[PDB]
Amino acid sequence: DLVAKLRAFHNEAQVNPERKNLKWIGLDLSNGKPRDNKQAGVFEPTIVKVKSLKFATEAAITILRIDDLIKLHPES
């Protein structure tokens, strides 16, 4: 429910040009309901999200590129 409610608010912000303030809505874990996190003071550095997406994608891409594993037995 929380994700659906959270997604509903964000969907409205993108399709309605006059409801752009809903981009800041996140999660209020204490009460379990969406909340404007920009006003609530829940901030993160932009580099944390940006570098996370770049690094996670490359790591996922690296594993996704494999389709065959040869595991040589140890010499001992």
Binding site: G41, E44, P45, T46, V48, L53, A56, A59, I61, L64
Partner: protein, 77 residues
């Protein structure tokens, strides 16, 4: 996770969760006879647009908040 710690210092748990989820959902497509190159190409495009979207619509300039921004950023961590 170690690389994220060295170059950022935060978001270490998130990046491992996202990467595993990205791989899990990508493998579902591969099982549906979608070629991995198509999935890889799609993931690369989405990562580029996600970064572009963040830098254009989801950033807040800290000069508009003053010292309270630093405390809130520290408190959130």
């Amino acid at each position: 996770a170690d690389l994220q710690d060295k170059e950022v210092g935060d978001g270490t748990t998130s990046v491992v969760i996202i990467a595993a989820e990205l791989l899990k959902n990508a493998d579902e497509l591969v099982k549906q006879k979608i070629h991995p190159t198509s999935v890889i190409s799609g993931y690369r495009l989405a990562c580029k647009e996600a970064v572009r979207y963040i830098n254009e619509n989801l950033i807040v300039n800290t000069d508009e908040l003053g010292r309270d921004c630093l405390i809130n950023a520290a408190k959130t961590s």
